[PDB]
RNA sequence: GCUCGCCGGAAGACCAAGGGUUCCUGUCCAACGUUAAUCGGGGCAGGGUGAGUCGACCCCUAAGGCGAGGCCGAAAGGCGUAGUCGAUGGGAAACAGGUUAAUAUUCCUGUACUUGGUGUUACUGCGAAGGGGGGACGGAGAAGGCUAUGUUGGCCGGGCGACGGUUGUCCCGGUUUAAGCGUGUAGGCUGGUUUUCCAGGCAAAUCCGGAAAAUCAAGGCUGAGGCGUGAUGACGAGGCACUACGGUGCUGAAGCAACAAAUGCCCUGCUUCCAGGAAAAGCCUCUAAGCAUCAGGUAACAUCAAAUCGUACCCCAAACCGACACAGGUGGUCAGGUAGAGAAUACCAAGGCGCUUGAGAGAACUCGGGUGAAGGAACUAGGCAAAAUGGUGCCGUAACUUCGGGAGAAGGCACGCUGAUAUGUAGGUGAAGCGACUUGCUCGUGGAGCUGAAAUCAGUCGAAGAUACCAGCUGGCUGCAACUGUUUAUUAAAAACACAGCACUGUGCAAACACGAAAGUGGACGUAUACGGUGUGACGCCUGCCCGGUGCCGGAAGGUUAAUU
RNA sequence: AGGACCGAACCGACUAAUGUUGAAAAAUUAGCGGAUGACUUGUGGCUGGGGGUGAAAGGCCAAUCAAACCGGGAGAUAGCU
């Protein structure tokens, strides 16, 4: 549920929270965990190469299981849980043989529900099938794009792709893009969508709710010297030029795409 | 007011030190030059 | 077991001074400008052979040589049990 | 030596860092010290630093560094695996008294504790660079239980007052005691115990995880404080002696209670929140290979070993960083009384100081202050500066608004002391006693004693009672930026930058993009509700027309067009 | 609850005076702003010069910054003094 704050303050005006009651609220699982410590954008050679990155709050990680290989065996749902490493939210799920693991939440999840990969599992969300298995025109999530690699596709918040066509060793998918693209029919997949839609609803409210997403502050190109940035001085407010990034490529409109090993997966660009 | 030398022997053998000259080949250079010129004290190190 | 030669080369100057007149006169502690390398365990074996008394334990301090003329000594402050020394 | 002033959450005390002998004693006064110096952080000589328990080293890991092979790069070399280093973090154990001219948790006295080796005895499954537990973790808030500590009473010792009074609701001082060991309670957490089974924990396990069944939830972990013992010991106001009057020596009373108490402890707890809060070893446990009447493990006892390095002194400063014995800078710990909400402030304690030129004089002028008749912003670029306001409780409070605000809006009133209600009230604490019990660190009941606001009524003093110090000026109309924030270290704090929100555009993951001859790495262990780049800048109402030109995107029939041939 | 409020430490730096051969190569004094946060601070580490870093001022990078410092080319060159 999105909820707004009362305006008792500024900076608490505008802030919508999405609230969860059904997120764990005690401590994440244990032996899934593992330190994730910052980078602050800089390579191994100490320099910035992605910038507005840095401080934050402290975040432990989390192991997925992405590739959803333990076949034949059901699971069943103990809990949702918050992740901070992503927009979506993960469950804890146990196996009968008692090995627990972490998922993506699909969208109808909830404790107690029973999950299972393979072949022969069931068509119901949650479930992970090879798409050769699965009927087209359905819904999933965190498809794989090679065989055995894990799920690399539609792993937000809320997520999906659609199954458009099976041609052969192929299967046709509309990805959020809007982009065709051609994959394996050996890929696995997993049945539903991505949980936790509310998300693209909350509003940050103030400029520290970003801070503490690790995102520093963005200075605009035109309001620099000529030495910082194309967007150089002029007296006053002056643009007189065309839009370019902070290393001269014309941004608004340029396309920067440039892989023919890819190309053949391509059915349509997106528009 | 607070001045550019806040000393720290750590940080001072860390940087300059014996063991960082000979480190890589151009404080090893520092060394050699050190040595020609005859100076008493090579290094930073005490 | 270690060598009769080491142990005299451990044993220096038997140190002479007010607070080591007292330490002897109180707890039996006899104070020896000893080598800079002398363990307690070679101070307690040398005493207790070269001049045959017997030691409780060794107190050593390292002494810091004063610029302009004292180089670096230890003093130990050989704390013997009943064995009267210097 | 006696007075006097000054700091007192510091201008006291203890350290880290840094320095380096500045520390104590004796001698000297050239130079040094903004003067003199008999003095000194100055010179010269001699001394001073004692650790199984404090710290380092050591064990272990973070960021990061280096890195055999390895992958790259004219060379130099870059990156990086196994690994190995790297604290600012995690891994064992000592307290109280006494003592030096200068060292003390180190020496001495008393009373403890930890780890390891080796033997003896008794009982025995032991055994990994491998599995599992544990270590192990955020912010904010709110109790409750305590202690440090304080105050008063009691007790003990002393006193009877330079000037009226002072044998008493009189005055002064002291009423201290630890680690350890024993007990295990305010509190916190968690159902326990057997039996069977197994697609999990790279293999296997009796351990962890999972699934059933039976039977009792009445069990266990954790935990301040109190109490006992340590300790008939030590310390102790003061007396009595020697004396060089430094100072040393001997003896030694009482050594209790109530109340108030933390920001310290229980508490790594509990409740909540989103931004979702290290690692590895020590430690516990499980087995593998292997070992088999061995070796190993457990317990008791005995014995030995715990090395090496640091320890002086300064440490908000005359010993560090500022060229200076420089009004500056500099991280941690402790924190007494009376007022007070307070770590503000005033005055004091313990302690520590009077700032290394003084003496006169009492001109102009300058600085730093006090007060001013009548006016009262007439000043000036401008109320700049000054002056003014200032506390708590209660009454009261407009436009406008995004309903939260505006708002301490504005504006008023009551504040001292004394006495009564009430020889001290409401409240807080709570002893004996009295019962109970699943019988003591128990629970009720009872109210002694202690502590103790606020109010009302009456009275009284000054010109004045938030009497000092401390401590909002207020209102009205407008420009700009929403806002809290950020910036031109050292003339610009702003209307500039940032900002939440908006839009556009790029990007299908070996992503775009960046740093890189490369190898690689960031983005991101993210994946289109995700990331980058650009402009705009909360919110509300909205964003019209123009594609000519210059970019960008798409198309390609035709013209022109490189190497090549 | 709050990039809430008031206000010490703490972190800053709006105004005035003084100082300007300073007590100080930017301080003192009186006021002033924030003070549970986009907070502040200790200790290590990391990014290097057409490079870094920058809530952007040509700020900052050891009192040096529209291209640091040191040494070298080097006795650059100077129709100028």
Redesign the pocket.
């Given at each position: 549920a999105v909820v707004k704050c009362?305006?008792?303050?500024?900076?608490?005006?505008?802030v919508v929270?999405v609230?969860n009651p059904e997120?764990?609220?005690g401590?994440?699982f244990?032996?899934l965990?593992?330190?994730?410590?910052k980078?602050g954008?800089?390579?191994?050679?100490?320099?910035?190469?992605?910038?507005?990155?840095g401080g934050?709050?402290?975040?432990?990680?989390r192991?997925?299981d992405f590739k959803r290989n333990k076949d034949?065996?059901?699971a069943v749902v103990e809990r949702l849980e918050?992740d901070?490493?992503?927009?979506?939210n993960i469950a804890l799920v146990?196996y009968?043989?008692?090995?627990?693991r972490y998922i993506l939440a699909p969208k109808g999840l909830k404790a107690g529900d029973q999950i299972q990969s393979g072949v022969d599992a069931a068509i119901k969300p949650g479930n992970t099938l090879p798409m050769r298995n699965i009927p087209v025109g359905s819904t999933v999530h965190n498809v794989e794009?090679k065989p055995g690699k894990g799920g690399?596709?539609?792993?937000?918040?809320?997520?999906y792709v659609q199954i458009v066509a099976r041609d052969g060793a192929y299967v046709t998918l509309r990805?959020?893009?809007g982009?065709m693209?051609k994959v394996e029919a050996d890929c696995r997949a997993t049945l539903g969508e991505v949980g936790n839609?509310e998300?693209?609803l909350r509003?940050?409210?103030?400029?520290?709710?970003?801070?503490?997403?690790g995102?520093?502050?963005?200075?605009?190109?035109?309001?620099?010297?000529?030495?910082?940035?194309p967007?150089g001085?002029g007296e006053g407010?002056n643009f007189g030029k065309?839009?370019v990034?902070?290393?001269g490529?014309?941004?608004?409109?340029?396309?920067?795409?440039?892989?023919k090993?890819?190309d053949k997966?391509?059915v349509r660009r997106?528009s | 007011?607070?001045?550019?030398?806040?000393?720290?022997?750590?940080?001072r053998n860390?940087s300059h030190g014996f063991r960082a000259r000979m480190?890589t080949?151009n404080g090893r250079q520092v060394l050699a030059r050190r040595r020609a010129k005859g100076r008493a004290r090579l290094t930073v190190s005490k | 077991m270690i060598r009769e030669e080491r142990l005299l080369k451990v044993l220096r100057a038997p140190?002479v001074?007010?607070?080591?007149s007292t330490?002897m006169e109180?707890?039996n502690?006899i104070?020896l400008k000893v080598a800079?390398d002398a363990?307690?365990?070679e101070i307690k074996a040398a005493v207790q052979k070269l001049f045959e008394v017997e030691v409780?334990?060794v107190?050593?301090?390292?002494?810091?040589g004063?610029?302009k003329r004292r180089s670096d000594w230890?003093?130990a402050?050989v704390?013997l049990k009943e064995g009267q020394n210097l």
């Open positions: 009362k305006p008792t303050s500024p900076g608490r005006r505008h929270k609230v997120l764990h609220k401590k994440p244990a032996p965990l593992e330190k994730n410590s980078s954008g800089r390579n191994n050679n100490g320099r910035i190469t992605t910038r507005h990155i934050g709050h402290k975040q432990a990680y192991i997925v034949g065996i059901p918050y901070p490493n992503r927009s979506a146990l009968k043989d008692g090995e627990r794009m690399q596709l539609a792993r937000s918040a809320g997520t990805l959020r893009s982009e693209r839609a998300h693209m509003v940050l409210g103030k400029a520290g709710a970003a801070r503490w997403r995102v520093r502050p963005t200075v605009r190109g035109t309001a620099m010297n000529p030495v910082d940035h967007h001085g407010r065309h839009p990034t902070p290393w490529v014309q941004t608004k409109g340029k396309k920067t795409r440039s892989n090993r890819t997966f391509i997106r | 007011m607070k001045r550019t030398f806040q000393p720290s022997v750590l940080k860390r480190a080949k | 140190h001074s007010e607070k080591a330490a109180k707890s502690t104070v800079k363990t307690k365990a409780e334990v107190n050593t301090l390292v002494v810091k004063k610029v230890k003093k402050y704390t």
